[PDB]
């Protein structure tokens, strides 16, 4: 046993499930009219973007 | 030395005093309508 | 009466309106999807009127934004909106958060003199204490300035657009391609902002639709210890002339380096600088001088950003 | 807005084995002969030039070519997508050997120099063998080559005189590539690099004469002041060359030959068919980017 | 308040715990000794 | 089980016609009904 | 000739307004967010206090006026449609379809 003592620090990760309470009417939401951009045009098929 | 050489020198120094006069962004504009959420729609809901 | 003739040439040369499909009501979603499909099907047929409807399309392009997630200890809350961004990717195994180096932050990692840049040291003395928290993440600010691999790690990105600064972690949005607009719906031209201390302007000479902005990262050694330097340039002279103009600016640095390294001169010491290409500015748009708490900062209008590789010069 | 879809028909259906090998490489940058949309199988891949390979004839070809990306492999045909300048796309990391791309990098498009299993897919339903290029990040893309250029030179000295090269010292420093904190052990059994090593060594003897002959002519009062500094970096033995031992018609043809191996060797490493990735997911392998030629 | 310190070998102003844990990999004990890190928290 | 609205709530434009004729006898009848609610129902006020 | 059995998956579709997360929100149908001033919807706060008298001295009625910011959110979606269906369902000859 040498003359000095010693301390040790270790870390540890934990996956933790959570509970989120939210109160009534806390945030107000809005809605804009979404626009239809078109892209990646082909003779076979058409792709849209919203 | 850019305030004077730019044209309309009297309207330039007057329109660049808005940065001192402005306090809220609805300062010079009038009020016309109200956008409620309903018919009274609350005393606490967002009115436009 | 003649203004009514101009009311037709305007209303016949406008772009077609973008379709608005309501996703909240029911019978207004039916009337909006149908006018996509009844109007696209007449932009495909081989008649003359269906070819008339395919020629009115106006393809304006949009920039490509980056989403960066920075520590607040390495990014100051006081940064002008439009500050340029350098990324740093030395190690990959963490992959948790990102380092973004504004030029007033990279001024502290270099350790370059406050007599070369007089004003921006005082502002970098109040936004950062002693440059420690910027340099706590790199254990090689002495071994990347010897071996000459610091410019290989920076990838330029683009100006600031949006920064939601928090206490611990700052979320920063940039604009990589194109004209830098604010992504939010009142779209404002957030142009690139540089301090007048860093930028060195080079200029009968012709002008195009272009004057580029270059970034030079120059290695040197002050107090017999390695310490780089970074300046910004601005000229529309073509890449063959600017490399000849940068070497005139750094004649007094190449001479006073190799005197200090006269006896010992390792092969890793020979690399000197590197020039990137940050983006273009259209001529007819002069930069506006602007002071911020005081720091003389240029602001550019319509700076559309590009990206070039680092090319070594000496 | 605009059409970019290069439908590659096939004269015969693909095999059940040959179909599933192309199903993996569904995001993949491919060189392609012409820009129009109805093409045959003989127009895609590097098999037009590489199906006994040479380096510079492919590297100069990848700048002048039209690059395109897979999107769909049905049995009877293919379908591609043409890649324009400053055009946003979505590339999948699929290239064997795996190199682990990163976001905010600059991917460069290189010729393949590894084996014929990693590079090409051999099709026998039609008689053509499509060849995939080497899409590696740019900083790793040159360290993977400047070390194998070292390996190709020292494996020719030990063929002529075996007592000069240590094999155990050779494959300890060349076959390991360190980039982004990771070590990639490459696979080497090199007739690809027999154009560079005959251009880089034929330039190796013209430079000590070429920098003394160019300094003895350019001496004057109006000398640029930085060349006084680099007047000392040149060694002692280089500054003892007698330029009188070669004739004046011989010293012309040791510059015009020399200046062509200076530029044409510098041009192929400053080629720009590169593309800037701005998003990358390490487990889905799907990456967004924008192409940028030269 | 009975004693000022459990050990002034790590709690010293010139303690070598500062010397070890102020100056790329992970650092577990850094969160207690680094003075300037504590001001962020 | 709980009960909500069927659709998103839509805004209503009010203040179009201001009708500006407003009289004094009607204003006093409205003001008596306005002040009496603070005694009657302080939380429910028109 | 012989039969062939087909089984199709049944997926429950999500509407935001039906899920009970919307008890923590007010959901307002709106038209045009192009027109709001940046970083500002002001709302005035009035906090009343207790009546006077008999050894009770309040810190008399305080009023904030605090301007808070709307926070933008971006949502992208992609719809792929075959060009055969769009073209056959809309023809110049408006005769009916099989």
Which residues, other chains included, contact A20 with Cβ-Cβ below 8 Å and sequence gap of 6+?
none
What is the distance between the alpha carbons of residues C225 and C236, in angstroms, rounded to a whole number?
36
Residue with tokens 């001496």: D219
Contact F10 G27 (CB under 8 A): no
Is the CB of residue G42 less than 8 Å away from at least one CB of chain B? yes
Backbone angles phi, psi at D144, to 5 degrees: -75, -15
Select from F2, F3, F4 the residue whose CB has the most chain G CBs within 10 Å, as the one to mutate to test that interface: F4
What is the distance between the alpha carbons of residues B46 and B32, in angstroms, rounded to a whole number?
17
Chain C nearest CA to A20, separation (Å): 21
G33, G83, G90: residue with CB nearest C38: G90
Contact G27 F11 (CB under 8 A): no
D105, D225, D226: residue with CB nearest C155: D105
What one-character-per-residue DSSP string does chain B give?
Answer: --TTTSS-HHHHHHHTTHHHH-SSTTSS-----EEESSSS--SSS---
Is the CB of residue F9 less than 8 Å away from at least one CB of chain C? no
Contact E24 C91 (CB under 8 A): yes
Using alpha carbons only, give the angle C246, C252, C255 rounded to the nearest 5 degrees: 110
What one-character-per-residue DSSP string does C215-247 give?
Answer: EEEE--EETTEE--EEEEEEE-S-HHHHHHHHH
* Chain C residues whose beta carbon lies within 8 Å of the beta carbon of residue F7: 24-25
**Beta-sheet pairing, D38-39 with D7-8:** parallel
What is the distance between the alpha carbons of residues D5 and G81, in angstroms, rounded to a whole number?
16
What is the distance between the alpha carbons of residues C124 and C106, in angstroms, rounded to a whole number?
10
Q: Which long-range contacts (CB under 8 A, 24 or more apart) does C282-285 make?
A: C282/C209, C282/C210, C282/C211, C283/C207, C283/C208, C283/C209, C283/C210, C283/C211, C283/C236
For chain G, which chains pass the contact test of at least 3 CB pairs under 8 Å? A, B, C, F
* Nearest one of D84, D56, D89, D52 to D70, comparing CA atoms: D89
* Touch D-B: 3+ C-beta pairs under 8 A: no
F14, F16, F46: residue with CB nearest B36: F14
CB contact at 8 A, D107 and D101? yes
Is the CB of residue E28 less than 8 Å away from at least one CB of chain A? yes
Is the CB of residue D222 less than 8 Å away from at least one CB of chain A? no
What is the distance between the alpha carbons of residues C128 and C105, in angstroms, rounded to a whole number?
8
What is the distance between the alpha carbons of residues C199 and C196, in angstroms, rounded to a whole number?
5
Is the CB of residue G26 less than 8 Å away from at least one CB of chain B? yes
Burial class (CB in 10 A: 0-12, 13-18, 19+), D41: buried
Q: CA of C288: how far to CAs of A22, C201, C291, D70, D86, in Å? A: 48, 14, 10, 47, 29
**E strands present in chain F:** 9-10, 12-14
D253, two tokens: 């043809």
Is the CB of residue E39 less than 8 Å away from at least one CB of chain C? no
Select from B30, B31, B37, B45 the residue whose CB has the most chain F CBs within 10 Å, as the one to mutate to test that interface: B37
Query: Between residues 10 and 49 of chain A, which touch chain C (CB distance below 8 Å)?
Result: 31-38, 46, 48
Chain C nearest CA to G42, separation (Å): 18
Chain A nearest CA to G33, separation (Å): 6
Q: Which residues are E6's β-sheet partners? A: none
Q: CA of D172: how far to CAs of C55, C59, C267, D21, D57, in Å? A: 63, 55, 21, 34, 31
* Nearest one of D31, D140, D28 to D73, comparing CA atoms: D28
Contact G37 B37 (CB under 8 A): no
Q: Which residue of A has its CA nearest to E30?
A: A9
* Chain B residues whose beta carbon lies within 8 Å of the beta carbon of residue G41: 46
Three-state DSSP string of C116-136 = CCCHHHHHCCCCCCCCHHHHC
Contact B36 F11 (CB under 8 A): yes
What is the distance between the alpha carbons of residues E30 and C314, in angstroms, rounded to a whole number?
42
Contact C44 G72 (CB under 8 A): no
What is the distance between the alpha carbons of residues C182 and C180, in angstroms, rounded to a whole number?
7
Which residues, other chains included, contact G66 with Cβ-Cβ below 8 Å and sequence gap of 6+?
G42, G43, G45
Which residues, other chains included, contact C142 with Cβ-Cβ below 8 Å and sequence gap of 6+?
C225, C226
Q: CA of G68: how far to CAs of A29, B43, C131, G65, G71, in Å? A: 15, 18, 34, 10, 10
Contact D3 A41 (CB under 8 A): yes
* Chain C residues whose beta carbon lies within 8 Å of the beta carbon of residue F8: 24
What one-character-per-residue DSSP string does D45-98 give?
Answer: SGGGT-----SHHHHHHHHHSEEEEEEEE-SSBEEEEE--TT-EEEEE--PSSP
Contact C87 D104 (CB under 8 A): yes
Select from G29, G33, G36, G48 the residue whose CB has the most chain F CBs within 10 Å, as the one to mutate to test that interface: G29
What is the distance between the alpha carbons of residues C301 and C284, in angstroms, rounded to a whole number?
10
CB contact at 8 A, C120 and C128? no
Name the experiment that determined this structure: cryo-EM
Q: Which residues are G68's β-sheet partners? A: G41
Strand, coil or helix: what is C207? coil
Is the CB of residue G87 less than 8 Å away from at least one CB of chain C? yes
Contact G34 C45 (CB under 8 A): no
CB contact at 8 A, C81 and C94? no
Other CB atoms within a 10 A radius of the CB of residue G13 amount to 5
CB contact at 8 A, A49 and A39? yes
Is the CB of residue C254 less than 8 Å away from at least one CB of chain D? yes
Omega before residue D97 within 30° of 0, cis? yes
Chain G nearest CA to A35, separation (Å): 10
Q: CA of A3: how far to CAs of A6, E5, E14, in Å? A: 10, 20, 22
Q: Which helix (H) or strand (E) holds C32?
A: helix C27-40
* Chain G residues whose beta carbon lies within 8 Å of the beta carbon of residue F4: 17, 22-23
Contact G37 B25 (CB under 8 A): yes
Contact E40 C73 (CB under 8 A): yes
CB contact at 8 A, D107 and D136? yes
Is the CB of residue A29 less than 8 Å away from at least one CB of chain G? yes
* Nearest one of C212, C233, C207, C229 to C220, comparing CA atoms: C229
Is the CB of residue A11 less than 8 Å away from at least one CB of chain E? yes
């Amino acid at each position: 046993h040498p003359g000095f003592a010693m301390t040790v620090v270790r870390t540890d990760e934990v996956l933790a499930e959570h509970i989120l309470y939210c109160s009534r009417a806390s945030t107000s939401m809005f809605v804009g009219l979404p626009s239809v951009v078109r892209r990646e045009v082909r003779s076979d098929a058409v792709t849209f973007e919203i | 030395a850019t305030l004077e050489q730019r044209p309309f020198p009297y309207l330039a120094t007057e329109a660049n005093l808005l940065t001192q006069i402005k306090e809220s962004a609805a300062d010079g504009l009038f009020k016309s309508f109200q956008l409620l959420l309903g018919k009274d729609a609350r005393e606490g809901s967002v009115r436009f | 009466e003649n203004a009514a003739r101009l009311g037709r040439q305007v209303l016949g040369l406008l772009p077609p309106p973008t379709h608005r499909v309501s996703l909240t009501r029911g019978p207004e979603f039916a009337r909006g999807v149908r006018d996509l499909l009844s109007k696209y099907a007449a932009s495909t047929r081989p008649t003359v009127g269906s070819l008339h409807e395919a020629l009115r399309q106006a393809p304006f392009r949009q920039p490509t934004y980056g989403d960066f997630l920075v520590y607040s200890q390495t990014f100051s809350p006081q940064e002008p909106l439009g500050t340029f961004l350098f990324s740093f990717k030395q190690e990959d195994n963490g992959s948790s958060m990102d380092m973004l180096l504004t030029p007033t932050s990279l001024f502290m990692l270099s350790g370059m003199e406050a007599a070369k840049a007089p004003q921006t040291h005082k502002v970098a003395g109040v936004w950062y204490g002693s440059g420690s928290g910027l340099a706590d993440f790199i254990p090689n600010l002495s071994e990347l300035m010897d071996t000459g691999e610091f410019h290989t790690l920076l990838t330029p990105v683009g100006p600031m657009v949006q920064s939601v600064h928090s206490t611990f972690v700052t979320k920063v949005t940039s604009a990589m391609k194109g004209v830098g607009l604010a992504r939010d719906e009142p779209r404002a031209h957030v142009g690139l902002t540089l301090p007048c201390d860093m930028l060195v302007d080079l200029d009968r000479e012709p002008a195009g639709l272009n004057v580029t902005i270059y970034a030079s990262l120059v290695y040197l050694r002050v107090n017999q210890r390695p310490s780089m330097a970074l300046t910004f340039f601005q000229s529309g002279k073509g890449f063959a002339e600017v490399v000849a103009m940068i070497k005139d600016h750094f004649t007094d640095v190449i001479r006073t380096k190799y005197i200090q390294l006269r006896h010992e001169l390792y092969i890793n010491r020979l690399v000197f600088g590197a020039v990137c290409t940050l983006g273009t500015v259209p001529f007819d748009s002069h930069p506006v001088h602007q002071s911020l708490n005081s720091l003389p900062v240029l602001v550019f209008a319509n700076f559309e950003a590009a990206c070039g590789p680092w090319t070594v010069f000496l | 807005a605009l059409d970019k879809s290069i439908v590659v028909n096939l004269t015969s259906r693909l095999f059940a084995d040959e179909l599933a090998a192309l199903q993996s490489k569904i995001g993949s940058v491919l060189p392609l002969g012409d820009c129009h949309r109805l093409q045959n199988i003989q127009a895609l891949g590097l098999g037009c030039v590489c199906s006994s390979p040479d380096y510079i004839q492919i590297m100069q070809y990848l700048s002048k070519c039209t690059l395109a990306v897979l999107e769909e492999v049905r049995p009877d045909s293919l379908r591609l997508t043409r890649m324009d300048p400053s055009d946003n796309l979505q590339i999948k990391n699929v290239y064997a050997p795996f190199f682990q791309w990163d976001s905010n990098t600059q991917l460069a498009v290189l010729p393949p120099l590894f084996s014929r299993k990693d590079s090409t897919i051999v099709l026998e339903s039609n008689g053509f063998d499509i060849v995939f290029p080497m899409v590696v990040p740019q900083q790793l893309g040159h360290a993977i080559l400047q070390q194998l250029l070292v390996y190709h030179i020292y494996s020719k000295i030990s063929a002529g005189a075996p007592g000069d090269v240590n094999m155990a010292e050779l494959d300890l420093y060349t076959t390991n590539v360190s980039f982004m904190g990771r070590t990639y052990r490459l696979d080497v059994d090199l007739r690809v690099l027999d154009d560079l090593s005959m251009y880089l060594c034929i330039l190796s003897a013209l430079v000590p004469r070429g920098c003394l002959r160019l300094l003895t002519a350019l001496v004057r009062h109006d000398r640029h002041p930085l060349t006084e500094v680099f007047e000392g970096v040149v060694p002692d033995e280089v500054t003892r060359i007698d330029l009188d031992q070669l004739s004046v018609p011989d010293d012309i043809t040791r510059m015009r030959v020399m200046f062509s191996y200076l530029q044409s060797l510098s041009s192929i490493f400053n080629l720009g068919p590169r593309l800037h990735v701005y998003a990358y997911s390490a487990e889905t392998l799907a990456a967004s980017c924008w192409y940028s030629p030269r | 308040e009975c004693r000022s310190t459990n050990n002034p070998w790590a709690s010293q102003r010139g303690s070598l715990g500062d010397v070890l844990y102020n100056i790329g990999m992970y650092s577990p004990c850094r969160q207690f000794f680094h003075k300037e890190d504590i001001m962020r928290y | 089980a709980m009960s909500g609205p069927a659709a998103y709530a839509s805004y209503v434009v009010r203040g179009a016609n201001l009708v500006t004729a407003v009289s004094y006898g009607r204003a006093m009848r409205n003001f008596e009904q306005f002040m009496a609610r603070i005694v009657d129902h302080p939380n429910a006020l028109p | 000739e012989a039969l062939l059995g087909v089984y199709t998956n049944v997926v429950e579709f999500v509407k935001f307004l039906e899920t009970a997360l919307a008890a923590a929100c007010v959901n307002t149908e709106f038209k045009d967010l192009r027109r709001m001033i940046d970083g500002k919807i002001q709302f005035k706060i009035s906090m009343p206090t207790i009546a006077h008298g008999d050894g009770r001295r309040p810190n008399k009625q305080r009023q904030y006026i605090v301007m808070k910011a709307c926070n933008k959110h971006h949502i992208g979606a992609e719809i792929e449609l075959a060009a055969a269906d769009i073209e056959l369902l809309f023809a110049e000859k408006e005769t009916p379809l099989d």
